Amino acid sequence: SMSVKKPKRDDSKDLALCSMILTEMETHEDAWPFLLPVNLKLVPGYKKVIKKPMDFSTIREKLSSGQYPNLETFALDVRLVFDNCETFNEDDSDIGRAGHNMRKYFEKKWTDTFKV
Numbered sequence: 265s266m267s268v269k270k271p272k273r274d275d276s277k278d279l280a281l282c283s284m285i286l287t288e289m290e291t292h293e294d295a296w297p298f299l300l301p302v303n304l305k306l307v308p309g310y311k312k313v314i315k316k317p318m319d320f321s322t323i324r325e326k327l328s329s330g331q332y333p334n335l336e337t338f339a340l341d342v343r344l345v346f347d348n349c350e351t352f353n354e355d356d357s358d359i360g361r362a363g364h365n366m367r368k369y370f371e372k373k374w375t376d377t378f379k380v
């Protein structure tokens with residue numbers, strides 16, 4: 265509270281670390297459904313069903329232009345990508361399984377990087 269400071273982590277490497285993690289996502293072989301925005305004019309139903317589209321290149325642009333206040337908002341966008349994927353794609357589809365794979369890959373990188 266006011267004048268009662270909570271010890272907080274050193275965040276100075278966060279930006280660099282998130283860029284690193286995002287580069288690893290982008291270079292993963294199953295990243296292909298997520299590299300670019302879904303083409304809302306070629307994909308039937310997506311615009312109406314998915315209220316907040318997100319993709320890696322958009323995350324990269326936001327990361328590169330100071331649009332993430334902190335680690336957590338970055339992680340929210342990454343998770344949104346896989347959340348949208350699950351919403352729209354069958355689990356037993358190539359894109360659906362890509363999503364589950366990429367999510368798992370992210371969470372491991374995330375844990376390995378930031379959680380002790």
Ligand SMILES: CNC(=O)c1cc(Cl)ccn1
Binds near residue numbers: 302348349352359
């Ligand atoms: C993340 N990409 C998708 O969810 C998607 C799904 C379909 Cl069917 C076509 C293009 N993109």
